Design a protein around this ligand. Structure first.
Ligand SMILES: CCCCCCCCCCCCCCCCCC(=O)OC[C@H](COP(=O)([O-])OCC[N+](C)(C)C)OC(=O)CCCCCCCCCCCCCCCCC
Ligand SMILES: CCCCCCCCCCCCCCCCCC(=O)OC[C@H](COP(=O)([O-])OCC[N+](C)(C)C)OC(=O)CCCCCCCCCCCCCCCCC
Ligand code: SF4
Ligand code: SF4
Ligand code: SF4
Lengths: 49, 155, 45, 293, 88, 176
């Protein structure tokens, strides 16, 4: 059943980066896709995890 | 327009040239073993994709790391000659950059510049792994902004 | 304030293994040979 | 349309030659706690394109003391060979069902030694001369183990027709009858295997050797109506073998030459002879000689 | 017709690839003889798969075994009298 | 106290020789090598994404240098020349002058960045914490002239890297 949860936890992972466009954005711009809790924002758009 | 085509072909060619380097590493001093620390899993200088050894003829960028003494002076210049174009060298460390801690010594050329032309100057004694990997990324962007095919069409 | 520097816990520290922990794994020498002929004899049959 | 079938083989094999390199670096990468190419495209999918077009844009420097004629035909043969032994493979139905396919495979794969021999001679360097000499003697040493293993294997098959291999195995994988030979065969395949070419030549040899080992020892069931069953089974088996082929690439210190000859002529050749003697009488021993027709 | 056609296109793509590639931008001899002598012995024992279906199979078994015994003897001799051991 | 590293002898009983013959004829120690790296294959990688995240550092980190200034904005340097004397590669060259106001600070401060060795003697030599090495390490260049620093560039970095320098020295002035 762990495969189900692992395959499950990869899906709201896709929802975490907004929609499909957001996930494709982070994958093609960072090659990292894992999402994290927001911590803070600088005055540049440099959004942090 | 031919100008647009030469721009697209320019972008297509160097995108490989900014993603498929092969470093001929010159293991000389503490900067050299520090490079192999970058190729270690903690930093993965092979994920961008440049092989740690790369052999003489199978190489693009020659990372001059360590003190460059006149003992090795002609050996490196003959090696730089054998390096096929496009060839770039990244002088790593204070010793290879200007001489560093042995600038006034009798048996070291002050800076790798006096022997070969350098594209990227990464400072450090030794430079921290990412501090040189960033320099590689700096060389990566330096390849992005070239007008090779554009200049040829302009001529 | 009292002196505070990098000091070990009062019980010192937990035990650190250092001997060779090479694992003792695998079946007996005759056992590998016995199955080896077993699969073979099955093979030709 | 038979010509279209050739391009429907040569190019995808050429791409197959191109695309398992990212598999190699990432398998070799993830093995050593590393990641492998993953920044250029999604998971390095475009990494092969990132290197190939760079290589073709790199000027091919030629040694001053190099015979151009040999320096350019040695890769010609090297690629010509590397994409020729893919033609008689009994993959579903082979392009060429040569009745002597095994012999053709051996004669033309043993011809690869000329490419490396010419490359060392044409390069005309102290490194190139010995390296060609070492590579060729290592190679020419190892067909005698190759030929005997394949010969002794084929006694229980029936002939050298590569298509007949499927009928022979059918019930069980043929390794279960010759597993001492499989390790004998698999190890020998490791050592037998311009500069832009030489990637392609030896590399198709790597996959085809494992494709050749796949059909030989680990067969599948070819349903006459549906052929996709054999396609998936053949690909899956030759992938597992190739992953193993790179599994051992970064798992042992590389052999040294004196042991390399010592390993064969003193610990591989005499045992190969015994197994051949075992597998020449056993079909006679149990009255299980196979039909050639 | 079909065979050389496959060979012809194979080298042609090999030709077009390399053409655009270079236009767009005592011991060693000793065993080599022993391999030669061994390889010729290999050819003698190659037709065995058809020979296994003869009617005189009784004389085949002794004869086919004789090569492998005799071939092994050449290896055994070559090993004992220094020889096959990697010379210097 | 000494420990032998190779004095074990193989027992010649049938079980041990069977182990040895089984070890070499059908390779097992080599297969154990395969099993070890296979377990390594099915393990997480330890490879960080640069520059999306980088390896951890310490408040004592020595990197790109930067002069500082007092909360008033007045420079800290007093041209006491301690840093030049101790600078082991003589990368410090400074010239003082009786500044018109009367505070009489330095006129020249050139760090030969390609001669420095990042040893950290300069910061500990300064009695007013004027010269410090910022935690920056990505300040590479394509020109030799860029590496040769000067008073203006040093002051600019102190104006640029100020949050880190103030915080790091705040986490360290009790240590040193
Ligand atoms: C995902 C898929 C995972 C499994 C993939 C296939 C197996 C390979 C990975 C697991 C390796 C396990 C290694 C292991 O148990 O090592 C300790 C054990 C024991 O190693 P050992 O050297 O400690 O054994 C001591 C006992 N004597 C000396 C008698 C041998 O390894 C083995 O038993 C290896 C056996 C290898 C057999 C090879 C010959 C047969 C090959 C048939 C065709 C294939
Ligand atoms: C009724 C039964 C009839 C048949 C019985 C047959 C005899 C019984 C079984 C004999 C042993 C098994 C068969 C032979 C195996 C090789 C023998 C040999 O020489 O071994 C020692 C040889 C040589 O060992 P050595 O050199 O240390 O010692 C040999 C002996 N002296 C010292 C005298 C020379 O072992 C090797 O060569 C080591 C391996 C070299 C290659 C490196 C990669 C190995 C990868 C292993 C994992 C992958 C395996 C894949 C298998 C195939 C999968 C499709
Ligand atoms: S710059 Fe420093 S670390 Fe690098 S080689 Fe010179 S002395 Fe060694
Ligand atoms: S860290 Fe650099 S500038 Fe400071 S004293 Fe050492 S060599 Fe001189
Ligand atoms: S930086 Fe510090 S040590 Fe150097 S001259 Fe100024 S006050 Fe003196």
């Amino acid at each position: 059943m762990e495969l189900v949860q692992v395959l499950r936890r990869g899906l709201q992972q896709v929802s975490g980066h907004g929609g499909l466009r957001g996930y494709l954005r982070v994958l093609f711009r960072a090659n990292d896709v894992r999402v994290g809790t927001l911590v803070g924002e600088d005055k540049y758009g440099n959004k942090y995890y | 327009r031919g100008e647009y085509v030469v721009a697209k072909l320019d972008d297509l060619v160097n995108w490989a040239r900014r993603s498929s380097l092969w470093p001929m590493t010159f293991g000389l001093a503490c900067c050299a073993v520090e490079m192999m620390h970058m190729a270690a899993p903690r930093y993965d200088m092979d994920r961008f994709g440049v092989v740690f050894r790369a052999s003489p003829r199978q190489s693009d960028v020659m990372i001059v790391a360590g003190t460059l003494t006149n003992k090795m002076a002609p050996a490196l210049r003959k090696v730089y000659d054998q390096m096929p174009e496009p060839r770039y060298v990244v002088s790593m460390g204070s010793c290879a950059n200007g001489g560093g801690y042995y600038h006034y010594s009798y048996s070291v050329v002050r800076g790798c510049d006096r022997i070969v032309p350098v594209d990227i100057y990464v400072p450090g004694c030794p430079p921290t792994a990412e501090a040189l990997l960033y320099g590689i990324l700096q060389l990566q962007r330096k390849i992005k902004r070239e007008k090779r095919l554009r200049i040829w069409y302009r001529r | 304030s009292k002196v505070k520097q990098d000091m070990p816990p009062p019980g010192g520290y937990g035990p650190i293994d250092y001997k060779r922990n090479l694992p003792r794994r695998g079946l007996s020498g005759y056992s590998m040979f016995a199955v080896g002929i077993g699969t073979l004899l099955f093979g030709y049959w | 349309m038979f010509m279209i079938n050739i391009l429907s083989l040569i190019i995808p094999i050429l791409l197959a030659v191109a695309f398992l390199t990212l598999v190699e670096r990432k398998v070799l990468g993830y093995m050593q706690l590393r990641k492998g190419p993953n920044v250029v495209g999604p998971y390095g999918l475009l990494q092969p394109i990132a290197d190939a077009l760079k290589l073709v844009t790199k000027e091919p420097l030629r040694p001053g003391t190099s015979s151009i004629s040999m320096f350019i035909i040695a890769p010609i043969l090297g690629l010509s060979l590397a994409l020729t032994m893919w033609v008689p493979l009994p993959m579903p139905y082979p392009l060429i069902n040569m009745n002597l396919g095994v012999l053709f495979m051996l004669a033309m794969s043993s011809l690869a030694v000329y490419s490396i021999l010419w490359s060392g001679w044409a390069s005309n360097s102290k490194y190139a001369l010995i390296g060609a000499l070492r590579a060729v003697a290592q190679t020419i040493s190892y067909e005698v183990t190759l030929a005997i293993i394949l010969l002794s294997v084929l006694l229980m098959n029936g002939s050298y027709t590569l298509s007949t291999l499927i009928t022979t195995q059918e019930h069980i994988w043929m390794i279960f009858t010759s597993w001492p030979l499989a390790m004998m065969w698999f190890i020998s395949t490791l050592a037998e295997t311009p500069f832009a070419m030489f990637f392609m030549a030896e590399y198709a040899n790597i996959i085809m050797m494992n494709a050749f080992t796949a059909i030989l020892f680990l067969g599948a069931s070819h349903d006459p109506h549906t052929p996709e069953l054999y396609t998936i089974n053949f690909v899956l088996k030759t992938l597992a073998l190739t992953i193993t082929f790179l599994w051992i690439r970064a798992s042992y210190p590389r052999f040294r030459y004196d042991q390399l000859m010592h390993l064969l002529w003193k610990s591989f050749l005499p045992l190969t002879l015994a197994l051949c003697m075992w597998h020449i009488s056993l079909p006679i021993m149990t009255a299980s000689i196979p039909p050639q027709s | 017709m079909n065979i050389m056609l496959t060979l012809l296109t194979n080298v042609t793509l090999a030709s077009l690839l390399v053409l655009i590639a270079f236009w767009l931008p005592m011991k060693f001899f000793l065993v080599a003889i022993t391999f030669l002598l061994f390889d010729l012995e290999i050819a003698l024992l190659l037709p065995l798969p058809w020979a296994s279906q003869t009617n005189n199979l009784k004389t085949m078994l002794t004869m086919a075994l004789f090569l492998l015994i005799l071939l092994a003897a050449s290896l055994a001799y070559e090993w004992t009298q220094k020889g096959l051991e990697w010379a210097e | 106290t000494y420990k032998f590293v190779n004095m074990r002898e193989p027992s010649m009983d049938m079980k041990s020789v069977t182990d040895r013959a089984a070890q070499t004829l059908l390779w097992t120690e080599l297969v154990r090598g395969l099993g070890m790296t296979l377990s390594y294959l099915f393990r997480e990688p330890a490879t960080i994404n640069y520059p999306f995240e980088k390896g951890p550092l310490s408040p004592r980190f020595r990197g790109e240098h930067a002069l500082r200034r007092y909360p008033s904005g007045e420079e800290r340097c007093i041209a006491c020349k301690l840093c030049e004397a101790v600078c082991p590669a003589q990368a410090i060259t400074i010239e003082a002058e009786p500044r018109a106001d009367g505070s009489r600070r330095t006129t020249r401060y050139d760090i030969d960045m390609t001669k420095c060795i990042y040893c950290g003697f300069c910061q500990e030599a300064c009695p007013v914490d004027a010269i410090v090495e910022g935690p920056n390490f990505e300040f590479s260049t394509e020109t030799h002239e860029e590496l040769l620093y000067n008073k203006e560039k040093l002051l600019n970095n102190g104006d640029k890297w100020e949050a880190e320098i103030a915080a790091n020295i705040q986490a360290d002035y009790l240590y040193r």
